[PDB]
Amino acid sequence: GMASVLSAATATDQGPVRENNQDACLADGILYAVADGFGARGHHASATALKTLSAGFAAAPDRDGLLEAVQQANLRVFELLGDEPTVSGTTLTAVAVFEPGQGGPLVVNIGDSPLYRIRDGHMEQLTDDHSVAGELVRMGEITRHEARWHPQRHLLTRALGIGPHIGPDVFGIDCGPGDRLLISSDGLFAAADEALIVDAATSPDPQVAVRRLVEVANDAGGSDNTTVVVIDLG
Ligand SMILES: [Mg+2]
Ligand SMILES: [Mg+2]
Ligand SMILES: [Mg+2]
Ligand SMILES: [Mg+2]
Ligand SMILES: [Mg+2]
Ligand SMILES: [Mn+2]
């Protein structure tokens, strides 16, 4: 029979507008993550977060170890960037594809880099966004689609590396053999037609999928960095 992860792929794209690629991604064993940095030192924030995350998970690869690794990533970024004259930080969305004996697949997320499940041709967002617009979705006041065009969607309500304390969301991922998971920065949904995003995201070869996802975002104007991690489950 089949492994729980069949294959995975990643892509990151600065796009034609931004002066830096302040996104970062990670694909290492059963650990997958995206971090979208912001601010003058946002690239430092996201890269440092993932380096720390990776090391902490490797030292303790279970649910509690993952959550401690996220705390350590927060602390390390805040120690390095907290004395700057303006605020820089990062989002973080991490997936660990644990076996059932370790509680099954888990997502830990802070900010607005979503996790999606792709099943039977449908793409749905599993995480809530910690942004002004995302909170209105969490309040049942606007839809995810409306949140996409909300004029305050760019304003985060939770972020890593901006203070000594963080409260990420933590939850199991309802998924199984045949599903595809996608972690993305918000650049993917900045502008493009949702149908074309789903077309790209359902490409059979995950290496093709990640390339096509970046291209869809770019073709639509590439106003932000776009980073995607695709994981095919067995
Ligand atoms: Mg960014
Ligand atoms: Mg639909
Ligand atoms: Mg956003
Ligand atoms: Mg953003
Ligand atoms: Mg955006
Ligand atoms: Mn972004």
mmCIF file of all heavy atoms in Angstrom, residues 18 23 36-37 112 185-187 224-225, ligand 6:
data_model
loop_
_atom_site.group_PDB
_atom_site.id
_atom_site.type_symbol
_atom_site.label_atom_id
_atom_site.label_comp_id
_atom_site.label_asym_id
_atom_site.label_seq_id
_atom_site.Cartn_x
_atom_site.Cartn_y
_atom_site.Cartn_z
ATOM 1 N N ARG A 18 6.957 43.722 -6.528
ATOM 2 C CA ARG A 18 7.665 43.871 -5.259
ATOM 3 C C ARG A 18 9.173 43.900 -5.436
ATOM 4 O O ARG A 18 9.723 43.201 -6.302
ATOM 5 C CB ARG A 18 7.335 42.726 -4.305
ATOM 6 C CG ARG A 18 5.867 42.566 -3.969
ATOM 7 C CD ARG A 18 5.241 43.812 -3.413
ATOM 8 N NE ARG A 18 3.877 43.638 -2.937
ATOM 9 C CZ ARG A 18 3.474 43.398 -1.721
ATOM 10 N NH1 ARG A 18 4.341 43.229 -0.738
ATOM 11 N NH2 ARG A 18 2.159 43.312 -1.497
ATOM 12 N N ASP A 23 8.481 36.283 1.029
ATOM 13 C CA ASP A 23 7.936 34.981 1.378
ATOM 14 C C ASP A 23 9.073 33.940 1.535
ATOM 15 O O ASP A 23 10.178 34.156 1.034
ATOM 16 C CB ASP A 23 7.017 34.459 0.286
ATOM 17 C CG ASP A 23 5.678 35.093 0.042
ATOM 18 O OD1 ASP A 23 5.263 35.993 0.786
ATOM 19 O OD2 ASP A 23 5.007 34.622 -0.925
ATOM 20 N N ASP A 36 4.962 34.442 5.138
ATOM 21 C CA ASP A 36 4.899 35.680 4.361
ATOM 22 C C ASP A 36 5.371 36.802 5.241
ATOM 23 O O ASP A 36 4.656 37.266 6.140
ATOM 24 C CB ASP A 36 3.459 35.883 3.872
ATOM 25 C CG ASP A 36 3.265 37.171 3.096
ATOM 26 O OD1 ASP A 36 4.235 37.964 3.060
ATOM 27 O OD2 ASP A 36 2.182 37.317 2.516
ATOM 28 N N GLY A 37 6.583 37.246 4.991
ATOM 29 C CA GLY A 37 7.155 38.388 5.758
ATOM 30 C C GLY A 37 6.588 39.696 5.285
ATOM 31 O O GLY A 37 6.180 39.879 4.122
ATOM 32 N N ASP A 112 -2.247 35.212 7.480
ATOM 33 C CA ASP A 112 -3.162 35.065 6.355
ATOM 34 C C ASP A 112 -2.606 34.268 5.178
ATOM 35 O O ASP A 112 -2.960 34.537 4.031
ATOM 36 C CB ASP A 112 -3.621 36.453 5.811
ATOM 37 C CG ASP A 112 -2.499 37.212 5.101
ATOM 38 O OD1 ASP A 112 -1.339 36.809 5.306
ATOM 39 O OD2 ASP A 112 -2.815 38.168 4.343
ATOM 40 N N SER A 185 0.929 31.657 0.259
ATOM 41 C CA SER A 185 0.849 33.050 0.732
ATOM 42 C C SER A 185 -0.364 33.670 0.057
ATOM 43 O O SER A 185 -0.920 33.195 -0.942
ATOM 44 C CB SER A 185 2.098 33.822 0.429
ATOM 45 O OG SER A 185 2.347 33.943 -0.959
ATOM 46 N N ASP A 186 -0.775 34.831 0.590
ATOM 47 C CA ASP A 186 -1.885 35.592 0.037
ATOM 48 C C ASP A 186 -1.658 36.103 -1.374
ATOM 49 O O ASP A 186 -2.590 36.553 -2.019
ATOM 50 C CB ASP A 186 -2.319 36.710 0.984
ATOM 51 C CG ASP A 186 -1.313 37.802 1.054
ATOM 52 O OD1 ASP A 186 -0.148 37.622 0.786
ATOM 53 O OD2 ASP A 186 -1.753 38.872 1.477
ATOM 54 N N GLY A 187 -0.434 36.096 -1.881
ATOM 55 C CA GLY A 187 -0.226 36.560 -3.252
ATOM 56 C C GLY A 187 -1.020 35.803 -4.304
ATOM 57 O O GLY A 187 -1.391 36.358 -5.344
ATOM 58 N N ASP A 224 1.935 40.927 -5.638
ATOM 59 C CA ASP A 224 2.597 40.455 -4.435
ATOM 60 C C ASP A 224 3.496 39.275 -4.807
ATOM 61 O O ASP A 224 3.427 38.698 -5.882
ATOM 62 C CB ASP A 224 1.606 40.056 -3.331
ATOM 63 C CG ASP A 224 2.100 39.911 -1.911
ATOM 64 O OD1 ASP A 224 3.294 40.185 -1.693
ATOM 65 O OD2 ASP A 224 1.263 39.516 -1.051
ATOM 66 N N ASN A 225 4.345 38.917 -3.876
ATOM 67 C CA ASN A 225 5.028 37.626 -3.867
ATOM 68 C C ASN A 225 4.012 36.522 -3.763
ATOM 69 O O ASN A 225 3.042 36.675 -3.012
ATOM 70 C CB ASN A 225 5.979 37.566 -2.680
ATOM 71 C CG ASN A 225 6.927 38.712 -2.450
ATOM 72 O OD1 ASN A 225 7.211 39.085 -1.288
ATOM 73 N ND2 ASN A 225 7.444 39.326 -3.487
HETATM 74 MN MN MN B 6 1.696 38.614 0.851
#
